[PDB]
Design a protein around this ligand. Structure first.
Ligand code: HEM
Ligand code: HEM
Lengths: 448, 449
């Protein structure tokens, strides 16, 4: 008699990425780990989500590669943000090489350039503070780091002229990453129109700067933008076009900003708390002076590399409040772990947050002890500390992140003396990148 | 194979309520309407999502009742917000009775009492403003409407003693409603732990106010709290307990606030855009002049209800940028509409946004024309305008809303010259309730003479 109305589409989105926007179920999963042990599963919309906790369990996740574990489906939200044929928009062939061009742009050689530029940038930034006040370091370090990134990662042109422009465009891309945007990246909604618009505006800006530089081999430049122009595929008359270069710029910002920003923020919020400051700031300050004795007052990479106690405080911030809570992969080729079997199609997760609160790995995991890392430096077992992931897809910007954040905090330890305003912040689980919840306040007093 | 590891949870939640937190996909749904006509289905994770567009299609949605269409599944997320055995946390027996008390709290009789309170609050609020400047109208009216609502709904005591406390308790409860919260409302995450604590806190506070009123029993209070204290279920005639009354309060706050505050904001942002002001402000003012001349400078019920041209400026805001984008039901019993059959278990949507952009109903749909309702109000055909739903579960607050927004824009119009700053805001689809996007700014200057 009467028919069904027309079906327009049948959509079955990848559920995994929803954990980044589930509002921080670190509670619910710590329970599950403590009842069922280091491997366990959750069915949601008929999609198996298997979790891997602590070192042993990590091994299948981090030790395997692209034939066995896929990054494509979890990171598919990033394709329209960076553009087509860029990282997770490019076929495997092209992507592995595109990572090589990033790896080059952040190699030790490359950072040697950036360290003077990162140092000036921050010494100038922190000059403008008064003799006194109170300030939200999260907003502070966010400004600073976006500055520092434009200088190092986008060259001198964009930095000193067009920062405001680039800062707003980035802000629009970031504002185009709603919770829907991980399940339907291409859904036509105003936020995604605004996103795609700002992305093209970023390419425009970047064509001008490339073309200006196309005309003038008269200079060679010491920044990522140059590295991306000098990069070529295997054999190919294919160099990297304007869209592609821009993409990798945007991905360097998207990975760069928030993670370094919040970790920098957490580093200081934990150190200048009352109990922590008594126990750990003397260690840290002696070190800044002992570094001054030998190397001088200018911060160089040689000197930043010797700040072990400061490093350990950053790393302890990172251990306790990791900024990315879950890294994930779709299983292309099943594996075994202890008794268990993990099928094709599963989505495996490792949670830095969760794994670095395991007691048999990190004694007193609920408490701030940066000095715990003098013993970790003796353990040879892999995948104990996984804030920066590991294996072949682990964090390429790790040293950058440590240099940026140690520079920031060195310059603040030299010039100012600092106390935390009231209670330590609890983490804000709204956004994809977890940071301390505003307002995150630090009293600064100078010293002549 | 080998041993599958411990599955600790298998869940398939109700997918439909996720459309409320989907970035405002009106584009997509409208592409689908224009291609497939006025009834069509999308599947997400297999679940059928059937949409009904325009007035013919609206009939199966609004004309049926609780036997045929269910509100349980789509409003599931709201249970932990209001509390247990409250509204969608209660069975139909107890729910429709609850809805019947709520209706008493919003009747023509009750509003007669409230309008003096609504007016006083508004005049005092705009009396604090400087000679001139710039205000964010939505921030502004959201503050006024919460103040006004605590007076009228929660009563004398709460408003003039511990406003700051309920306001931040409401803020917590609003903050425990994340996109994850529609799919999994009892997930133990900090935001839900903080929500549950704030709900319980509001009980405790309302136990205080209730017990002190009961020990002083001979006192008339004109407020929703009184009505709910005097309400009794059928047969047994048990009094509503402390947490049930608190629940009904929270539910009225969660209905009243954002929808009125955004609509009120739109009412003024549209009216004062340069073209729309040139075209339509003359008549609003001219209306206000004649009301004063006839009624005196007081704002009573009678004088507001005579404000037909302003009422249309608000009704038109609502037609174009309605705050609730989708109302939905779960089909208990199949039904036929023209050629078609919608089955048991489908989820049916009507989108006030979509359905009031349909040209065959609203000529020049994408155009600001308050005076369209001179003609449009004389239409015999039901379910044409649907900003407030209709039928069994249409908005019981329709009149409070218009009274509150008309009161607001009366005070503003009589006391200031107003201008819009730069671009008319595009709406923001990143909260559940949809409003104009910040910064949404009006320039003001008090009337000189
Ligand atoms: C505290 C700061 C940071 C943290 C915690 C962090 C964390 C991580 C993690 C966990 C991964 C692995 C993702 C996965 O395999 O699924 C990763 C990958 C990566 N990170 Fe970071 N990161 C930080 C800073 C940076 C910075 C500053 C940059 C660049 C300027 C950067 C660039 C990258 C890149 C390119 C990868 C991709 C590696 C690949 O897929 O081969 N990161 N990061
Ligand atoms: C501009 C302001 C408002 C708009 C646009 C609006 C819109 C709506 C809509 C569309 C519905 C139908 C929901 C459905 O069918 O599932 C509804 C129901 C309702 N509204 Fe409103 N509303 C507004 C103001 C208010 C206010 C101020 C209150 C109370 C103080 C209120 C209380 C209710 C109640 C109790 C219902 C439920 C009817 C039921 O389930 O039987 N509304 N509203």
């Amino acid at each position: 008699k009467g028919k069904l109305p027309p079906v327009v589409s049948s959509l079955i989105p990848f559920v995994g990425s929803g954990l980044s926007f589930a509002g921080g179920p670190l509670q619910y999963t710590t329970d599950a780990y403590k009842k069922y042990g280091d491997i366990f599963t959750m069915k949601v919309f008929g999609q198996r989500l298997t979790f891997l906790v602590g070192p042993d369990a990590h091994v299948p996740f981090f030790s395997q590669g692209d034939a066995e574990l896929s990054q494509d489906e979890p990171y598919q939200f990033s394709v329209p943000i960076f553009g087509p044929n860029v990282v997770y928009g490019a076929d495997l062939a092209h992507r592995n090489q595109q990572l090589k061009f990033i790896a080059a742009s952040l190699s030790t050689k490359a950072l040697q350039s950036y360290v003077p530029l990162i140092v000036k940038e921050a010494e100038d930034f922190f000059a403008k503070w008064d003799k006194s006040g109170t300030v939200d370091i999260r907003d502070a370090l966010a400004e600073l780091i976006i500055l520092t990134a434009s200088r190092c990662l986008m060259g001198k042109e964009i930095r000193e002229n067009l920062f405001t422009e680039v800062a707003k465009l980035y802000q629009t891309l970031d504002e185009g990453l709603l919770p829907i945007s991980v399940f339907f990246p291409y859904l036509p909604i105003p936020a995604h129109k605004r996103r795609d618009e700002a992305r093209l505006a970023m390419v425009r800006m970047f064509k001008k700067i490339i073309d200006e530089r196309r005309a003038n081999p008269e200079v060679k430049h010491n920044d990522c933008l140059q590295v991306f122009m000098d990069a070529r595929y295997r054999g190919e008359e294919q160099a990297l076009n304007d869209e592609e270069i821009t993409g990798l710029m945007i991905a360097l910002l998207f990975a760069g900003q928030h993670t370094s920003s919040v970790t920098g923020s957490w580093t200081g919020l934990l150190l200048f708390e009352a109990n922590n400051k008594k126990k750990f700031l003397p260690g840290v300050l002696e070190e800044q002076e002992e570094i001054r004795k030998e190397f001088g007052d200018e911060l160089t990479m040689e000197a930043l590399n010797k700040m072990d106690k400061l490093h350990r405080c950053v790393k302890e911030a990172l251990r306790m409040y990791p900024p990315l809570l879950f890294v994930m992969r779709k299983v292309i080729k099943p594996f075994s772990y202890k008794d268990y079997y993990v099928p094709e199609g599963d989505t495996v997760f490792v949670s830095p947050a969760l794994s670095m609160r395991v007691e048999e790995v990190f004694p007193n995991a609920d408490q701030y002890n940066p000095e715990r890392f003098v013993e970790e430096d003796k353990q040879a077992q892999k995948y104990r500390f996984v804030g920066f992931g590991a294996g072949r897809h682990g964090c390429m910007g790790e040293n950058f992140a440590y240099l940026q954040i140690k520079t920031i905090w060195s310059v603040l330890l030299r010039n100012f003396d600092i106390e935390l305003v009231g209670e330590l912040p609890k983490p804000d689980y709204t956004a994809m990148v977890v940071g301390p919840a505003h307002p995150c306040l630090l009293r600064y007093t100078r010293k002549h």
